[PDB]
Amino acid sequence: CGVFGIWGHEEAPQITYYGLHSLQHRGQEGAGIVATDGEKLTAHKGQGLITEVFQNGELSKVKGKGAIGHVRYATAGGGGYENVQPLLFRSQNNGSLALAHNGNLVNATQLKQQLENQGSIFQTSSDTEVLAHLIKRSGHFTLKDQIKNSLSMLKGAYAFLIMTETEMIVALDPNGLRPLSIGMMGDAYVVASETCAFDVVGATYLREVEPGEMLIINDEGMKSERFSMNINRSICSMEYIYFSRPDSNIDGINVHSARKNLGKMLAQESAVEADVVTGVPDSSISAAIGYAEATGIPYELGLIKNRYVGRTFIQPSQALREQGVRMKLSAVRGVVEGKRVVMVDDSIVRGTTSRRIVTMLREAGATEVHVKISSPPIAHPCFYGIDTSTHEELIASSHSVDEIRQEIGADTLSFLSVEGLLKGIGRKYDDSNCGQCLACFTGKYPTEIYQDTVLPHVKEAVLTK
Amino acid sequence: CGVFGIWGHEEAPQITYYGLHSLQHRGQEGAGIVATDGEKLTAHKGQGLITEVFQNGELSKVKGKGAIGHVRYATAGGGGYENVQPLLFRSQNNGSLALAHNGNLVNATQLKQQLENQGSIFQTSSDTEVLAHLIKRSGHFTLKDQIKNSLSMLKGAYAFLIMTETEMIVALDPNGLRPLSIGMMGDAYVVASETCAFDVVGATYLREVEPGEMLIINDEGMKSERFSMNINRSICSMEYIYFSRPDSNIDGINVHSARKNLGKMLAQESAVEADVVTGVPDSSISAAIGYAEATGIPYELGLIKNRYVGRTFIQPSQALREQGVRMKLSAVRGVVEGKRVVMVDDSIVRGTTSRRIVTMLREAGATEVHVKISSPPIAHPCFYGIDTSTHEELIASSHSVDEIRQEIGADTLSFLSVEGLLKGIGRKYDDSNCGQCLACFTGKYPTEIYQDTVLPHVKEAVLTK
Amino acid sequence: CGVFGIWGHEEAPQITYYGLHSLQHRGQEGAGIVATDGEKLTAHKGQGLITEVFQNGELSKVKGKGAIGHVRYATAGGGGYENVQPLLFRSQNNGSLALAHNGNLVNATQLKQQLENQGSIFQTSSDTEVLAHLIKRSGHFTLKDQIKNSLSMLKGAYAFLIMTETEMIVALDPNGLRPLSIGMMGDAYVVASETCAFDVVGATYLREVEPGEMLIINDEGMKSERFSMNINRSICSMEYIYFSRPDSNIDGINVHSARKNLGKMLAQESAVEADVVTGVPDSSISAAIGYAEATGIPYELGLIKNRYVGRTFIQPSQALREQGVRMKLSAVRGVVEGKRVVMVDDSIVRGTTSRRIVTMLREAGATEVHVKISSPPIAHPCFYGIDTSTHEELIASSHSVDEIRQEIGADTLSFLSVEGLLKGIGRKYDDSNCGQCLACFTGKYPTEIYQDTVLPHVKEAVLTK
Amino acid sequence: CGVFGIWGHEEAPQITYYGLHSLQHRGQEGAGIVATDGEKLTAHKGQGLITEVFQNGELSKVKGKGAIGHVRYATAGGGGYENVQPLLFRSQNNGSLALAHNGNLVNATQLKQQLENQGSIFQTSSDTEVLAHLIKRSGHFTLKDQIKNSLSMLKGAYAFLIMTETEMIVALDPNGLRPLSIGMMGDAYVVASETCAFDVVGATYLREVEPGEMLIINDEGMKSERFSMNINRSICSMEYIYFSRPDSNIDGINVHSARKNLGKMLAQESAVEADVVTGVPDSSISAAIGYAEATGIPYELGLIKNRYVGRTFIQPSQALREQGVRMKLSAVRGVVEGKRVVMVDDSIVRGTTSRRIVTMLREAGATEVHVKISSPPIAHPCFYGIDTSTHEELIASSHSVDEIRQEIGADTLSFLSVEGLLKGIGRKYDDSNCGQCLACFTGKYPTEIYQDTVLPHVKEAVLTK
Numbered sequence A, B, C, D: 001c002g003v004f005g006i007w008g009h010e011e012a013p014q015i016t017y018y019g020l021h022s023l024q025h026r027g028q029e030g031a032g033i034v035a036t037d038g039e040k041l042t043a044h045k046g047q048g049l050i051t052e053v054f055q056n057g058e059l060s061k062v063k064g065k066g067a068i069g070h071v072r073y074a075t076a077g078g079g080g081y082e083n084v085q086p087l088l089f090r091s092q093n094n095g096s097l098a099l100a101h102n103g104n105l106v107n108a109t110q111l112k113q114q115l116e117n118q119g120s121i122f123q124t125s126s127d128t129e130v131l132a133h134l135i136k137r138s139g140h141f142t143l144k145d146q147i148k149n150s151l152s153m154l155k156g157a158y159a160f161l162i163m164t165e166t167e168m169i170v171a172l173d174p175n176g177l178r179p180l181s182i183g184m185m186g187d188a189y190v191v192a193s194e195t196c197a198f199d200v201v202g203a204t205y206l207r208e209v210e211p212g213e214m215l216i217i218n219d220e221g222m223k224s225e226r227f228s229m230n231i232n233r234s235i236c237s238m239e240y241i242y243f244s245r246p247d248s249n250i251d252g253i254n255v256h257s258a259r260k261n262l263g264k265m266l267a268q269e270s271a272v273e274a275d276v277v278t279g280v281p282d283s284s285i286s287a288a289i290g291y292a293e294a295t296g297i298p299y300e301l302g303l304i305k306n307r308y309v310g311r312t313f314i315q316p317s318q319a320l321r322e323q324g325v326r327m328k329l330s331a332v333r334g335v336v337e338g339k340r341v342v343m344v345d346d347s348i349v350r351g352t353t354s355r356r357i358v359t360m361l362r363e364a365g366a367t368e369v370h371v372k373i374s375s376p377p378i379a380h381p382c383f384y385g386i387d388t389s390t391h392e393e394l395i396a397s398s399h400s401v402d403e404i405r406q407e408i409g410a411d412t413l414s415f416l417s418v419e420g421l422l423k424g425i426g427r428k429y430d431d432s433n434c435g436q437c438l439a440c441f442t443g444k445y446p447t448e449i450y451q452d453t454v455l456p457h458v459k460e461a462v463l464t465k
């Protein structure tokens, strides 16, 4: 998922639409904007793409000088309109409250159970809602402090944008697992999960949001505060490996560049003698470019991705698929035929895509296919976001690198060492891990996981199918 | 536009749908499929993306073992449902005829005049409709010979696919201006505008359709006949430079490879000392890869394209635009800032896009923007297809290269030479031009152009706006 | 089907949309409007309801001071876009021609076979296309003389509106089988299939178009000419019995009042003793009111029709249907229980509805159900329009009135006599038939019916299902 | 709004689609269905007509043997997805609950105000949500007993349907202001606001739900407990006068017959010499027939309503409107010209429709237009339902019958008397009001209205516009 907010722009919902649109790769399962004019909160949301939701007719109904928005992921595409964020709570003779979140709370099961016994009913299956109930039951005398202390009760990954009629409150968890960055646009402040949305919108980037920090932004300006001084910096490593758009800079490290270095690191860890380097369209293009350059083997387009495959694309029958019919990716014979191909891919999670890709690449006539992954094996469950998790198996859970080389049928398979990865991304944070979360790879989480903690996706509500 | 056909496959409308979707880049303004079962022709078509047109519920209406499909381009996005192809003409006690075209008949106004005078009424503004009036009024004695001699009355560019209940006729013009290839998929014969459609569907390439050749495909098999032994091979150079999918091989020369060599010719004709090579997303990635390798300047992703802009995407206002809001493309500050960039693009037609890209590139921090273009200047009009024409002004009609350079705002501008273009593509054909059409660049059209000849867009029917 | 036209009103497409909207009852399978400003005809059409076709965004494109529109009936709901009208032909350096028909040409096959022999290809199975081809192939010097002379070659029913950039030509066949009337709305002349359209649009009625008359309406005024002086007036009796909207007046006789008089005839021809009178929702309300008024038995609402059934209404399964789920109509038990019902309907065609209704009336507790039908039996086919014919078996062909009574399960069954039908409508014309077509009742057609005359629906194009 | 539920049928969501369809006239702003198989609740809901909401694909996703459904009214067509019911609240490790309401809680502001002071956040502005919070916070031990005591706190009109995975609880307020009737369909119990739903679906009437009664339906069967003894019968008089479909029986009295009697009362209290009785298409058809019969003046269709006006219908401009273009209703000249017309309407609420109708009738040539109303003046507000209130000015709050006669332009104007009304409907309930709510007419409410009580509409959520 991804979040965007702007306080102090008279066209703030139109800007949130473009901002949210740069973050459209972070989830296509729902989108929504809530805006305040200082008097009242107006909103629109729905399932699907920002263009699908705001066909238009709808961007006209959201007016305000400040707005927050959210782009949402859902594993099983559907989940319900219920969970499309921002969530909005109204209280007459007390105010409106809107909230958006990118992350996953590890103790939300537990908290919902306690809340229901204090007499709470839940309508969504969102972690945002759990926060709404906690602010409301807080005994502190100020919204800033009720939020400030409700965050004390939450465990896990979270980027929250909260907005009422009169101020935007931004908070980043003490590990800083999810990205949140502040930029400026005139005299408006803007907060976004990735800096590429500032590029798109015309906003000058100011700085990241510290782990454990909470910003109150309103007509007086931006106020900072720190709800936790006990911090442990460990950003999601996959943000740099696969999830962020290439033109974002996570902590000042540009994602294209970092990814290119993982191709470079991979080359120096594992060269092969071969004739062509191909990446995989869109996920490993940058790393393939870096690997090819470090190695001197020419960089080629040996896989092409169809640009118009969507939810409306009819998938081929198993029969057509065994007859030869491709769906989103096909190997290109005019480049790979009679060549020894190295296929750089950013990661193997289930094993499925690399297998299909080694086969396509063999049918096109590659005589050797070597697979190079700019990641360590992903062995463990991510408990920090629907987007960063999978409900399907991790073959590294059960297989070795020779058993995975064997399942996908590579002539050879390589992963980056944890050491090469950290070396490659290049953070300057003194500790073992340079301030990054490596738990999917290594098993060691920067967070206490509970016995009750469910895998993020498990929190679903609408069936869809 | 692009056509696709298959005779003898028990799943022919489905195969035609996957075939047309790999040709979707060839036109997004309408799509259609006409299929036959030996008995009656059933058909579905409409305006829009293939997936918009067969949402589904609809491919299940169109059934048969033979099928032809067309993907259409219209400059004024609209044109009218009437112009969406295939065109189906019906006659009880004499048969159905379905026709799809890719090319532009340069003598169609003249032929329509002579036809309305012999009593003809025209429902569309399609050339396809001109061809069907000529078949009906032909006094030759067999369908094959009527098409064969109506083809002789046509001037310009054409790849025609014709289908009745019982056969499929394919014809390629005497210059071979627009492409066509034949493949086989088990026992079925398939025809496509580019070979990438064979790759996707799982069909074996056999050969191209010869300039001046016509194939009669049916249940007996495939028959060839030459309707003109007076041929002058001149294929569209822009097919190679820009229009084809990268994985397609035109006349056995792979399109990615060719473009990459065009980058290597540009590097030796005009190599500059700079820090970064960047292509423009999607249109000049391969030429920029080749330029970069040729030159030893590292290839970066200095520009990004938003994957979700579209006909529903709300375009930003003029105000928002001068506030700095981006639409489909942005430069990536993390790669170009403080750097000297070479921006390699395949072609400059109107000069709008590179003026925008050099600006954005300066705004993001490039100390130098050097623009290298893998084409000669396009100074003359194309009369051989809507898809290969523009209705806006070619500035190299008016501007010298330094006048274009000043206008787009580049530090330098360099185009490929015609000697370097023919050298880069590598066609082995004994003549000045290696079998290509260089008219937009040189002024020498390979067909006669009349004083009555309209430029492709001029033929429109619906307003749309 | 229904046609509407207005010349000389600057808001003419909008007026045509409301005018056609009041004739929507004549056709639910397509709607289209063509308008002219003096230079160009602009048009929009599609399948479905007017409201469906013109969501809006669309009615903004059809701009002009003259417009013609058509509402279409297609039996097997579909036909295909191609048969949706008005048909628009364009011809550079010679003019566009839009045409809309309501009727059926009994010798269309013969004429089409001839035109194909002179080199014509047809794209639609529209009679309008036949007329378009006859006009062009006429030798005459002026559109008026070419039309005048083409109409001579037409046999069957026809109300035609033709339109060009500069004039409208209206023409009605020598029998006046189908109604047309003229109105004036300020200075604009309006033309419509029924007068309710004029009530709805604020136009004043003028007069009926004469059988054999063609009118040329343009900015000079309207001119009447006679293209056939050999007329034998035979209006569709079913226009009066069932098809027209109750507030329309055919030859100055009001449709509700005529139908109510047919209700008073049936009471003097067949008065029975019962308790409650009920018509059927919507088709036989006025007649039911007449039979009750005549009789002194109270008129009740003993059947209800659901206002929200339509194409998007899911039909009950066979299972659910015999469990007792009703679809459009249900008997109101609270009116009919233990009561002797006379149920008045306008006509029995297939036998189905009357069987369904008498079953429900008995299920709701009725003690006797006496069907009274205000029509003679319909025993012969209609060759004068899809809207007035059926593809299904008519039971009065095979069954005597007692066998039809046994089939529908009524206690008694009475049909209006032809003499009562003629006395009931009250047309003042001197001849046997009071100027009415009664072919479907008596077997005798007001027109020559060929061995090549197909039933109108047998002229279909698209499968749809 | 209307509610329908069925317990114990394998095809229960389908039965509810049809049930909800017969009640579609009670509200057109949303539709929802929640089914239970014994293990889990599945739902689907959305704004628009049932046929719009369940296009299908959707109805098949709901599965179970028990289901509840609601059809919603929203004054301003809008309110937002949140207010569309049945509301569903989930709790893992405590069960799901679904609720549908038809009524208005006159004390809900007070109740929300209390709930919020106990830690409750609210997401929708529905009263169903208020009850939800109140059941969860109830100290009692069994769900039955929780509901029993929450209902005791509610002030106003309410017909609740509650459903969990295993039982359906039905409850009607102590005045029975809104109808609920129980029927039986095999062994499945079925509950609906109007009995037409039973007809339409094949359910056999059983008995009405008593006021202050609650029923617990589950696989054991049906249980009944009186949550209140202190009851004061006052059914809505407007259910009889206008709101119910004409085949429903409210309290064993048929709505068309009761309406026809109100027509006969108005006749004996205000008779006139005129030549035509006309009703207004659909609301006053039954009363108009009663008046004509009692008066001996002929009943005619003097006004037609257009069957195809909709949300999607493009409203005429002011200029088109004053040019004479009609919207949903037109007057018929063939019936009323040169005639004295009595127009019987069911009620006058803002005075707009009847001014509009009397003008049209005069423009059609009527000499006299005498308006008779089968209601008293509606001079007071309704605080018991959005469907039975208007947010607009009631003109009998400010105007006398003669000021109203002048405003609407009537030749003469009459309203029924409260006595004539109680007498026409025919309840023999001993008490002054025959067991009816007459507040809108007399100012006497059957309930305590609070100083905090707002008019139903004022509780609006989404802006829409």
Ligand SMILES: Nc1ncnc2c1ncn2[C@@H]1O[C@H](COP(=O)(O)O)[C@@H](O)[C@H]1O
Pocket: A025, A241, A242, A243, A244, A245, A246, A281, A282, A283, A284, A305, B304, B305, B306, B307
């Ligand atoms: N506009 C874009 N340009 C290039 N890569 C993109 C873009 N948006 C997202 N990405 C990358 O696309 C990859 C995911 O796409 P895919 O794996 O092809 O579905 C991610 O690794 C992203 O970093």
Ligand SMILES: Nc1ncnc2c1ncn2[C@@H]1O[C@H](COP(=O)(O)O)[C@@H](O)[C@H]1O
Pocket: A242, A283, A284, A345, A346, A347, A348, A349, A350, A351, A352, A353, A354, A387, A388, A389, A390
């Ligand atoms: N958590 C994730 N969710 C979705 N896509 C992922 C995830 N992690 C990585 N990806 C993409 O999935 C690929 C591996 O696919 P598979 O092996 O089929 O699971 C990687 O190359 C990524 O492009």
Ligand SMILES: Nc1ncnc2c1ncn2[C@@H]1O[C@H](COP(=O)(O)O)[C@@H](O)[C@H]1O
Pocket: A304, A305, A306, A307, B025, B242, B243, B244, B245, B246, B280, B281, B282, B283, B284, B305
């Ligand atoms: N699926 C695809 N993968 C990669 N490039 C493509 C694809 N389809 C078309 N192209 C190229 O994209 C360019 C057009 O994209 P653009 O000019 O960015 O809109 C052309 O130069 C095509 O050769």
Ligand SMILES: Nc1ncnc2c1ncn2[C@@H]1O[C@H](COP(=O)(O)O)[C@@H](O)[C@H]1O
Pocket: B242, B280, B283, B345, B346, B347, B348, B349, B350, B351, B352, B353, B354, B387, B388, B389, B390
């Ligand atoms: N005939 C053409 N029609 C459409 N796009 C074109 C054409 N020729 C080249 N292109 C694209 O136009 C670009 C030049 O854009 P401009 O200079 O704004 O006309 C190239 O990079 C191609 O992507």
Ligand SMILES: Nc1ncnc2c1ncn2[C@@H]1O[C@H](COP(=O)(O)O)[C@@H](O)[C@H]1O
Pocket: C025, C241, C242, C243, C244, C245, C246, C281, C282, C283, C284, C305, D304, D305, D306, D307
């Ligand atoms: N707006 C309308 N009001 C009343 N009756 C109508 C209307 N439009 C069409 N009709 C009549 O309704 C009958 C067809 O409707 P139905 O029988 O309900 O399908 C015909 O007899 C028409 O004359």
Ligand SMILES: Nc1ncnc2c1ncn2[C@@H]1O[C@H](COP(=O)(O)O)[C@@H](O)[C@H]1O
Pocket: C242, C280, C283, C284, C345, C346, C347, C348, C349, C350, C351, C352, C353, C354, C387, C388, C389, C390
């Ligand atoms: N030609 C026709 N086609 C369609 N509806 C018709 C036609 N003639 C009469 N109707 C209607 O069909 C009824 C007879 O229906 P059925 O006997 O089931 O065919 C009458 O009440 C009319 O509403």
Ligand SMILES: Nc1ncnc2c1ncn2[C@@H]1O[C@H](COP(=O)(O)O)[C@@H](O)[C@H]1O
Pocket: D242, D280, D283, D345, D346, D347, D348, D349, D350, D351, D352, D353, D354, D387, D388, D389, D390
């Ligand atoms: N509560 C109400 N809300 C909506 N329509 C109503 C209401 N009460 C009566 N009606 C209709 O409104 C008509 C009166 O219209 P008007 O006087 O313009 O409000 C009556 O014939 C009813 O059909």
Ligand code: SF4
Pocket: B177, B235, B236, B237, B238, B239, B381, B382, B383, B384, B385, B388, B389, B437, B438, B439, B440, B441
């Ligand atoms: S003139 Fe240019 S774009 Fe046109 S056919 Fe020739 S090479 Fe192609």
Ligand code: SF4
Pocket: C177, C235, C236, C237, C238, C239, C381, C382, C383, C384, C385, C388, C389, C437, C438, C439, C440, C441
């Ligand atoms: S045969 Fe019947 S339906 Fe046909 S035109 Fe004559 S009266 Fe009308």
Ligand code: SF4
Pocket: D177, D235, D236, D237, D238, D239, D381, D382, D383, D384, D388, D389, D437, D438, D439, D440, D441
């Ligand atoms: S005030 Fe009137 S409309 Fe409201 S509940 Fe009472 S009778 Fe009904």
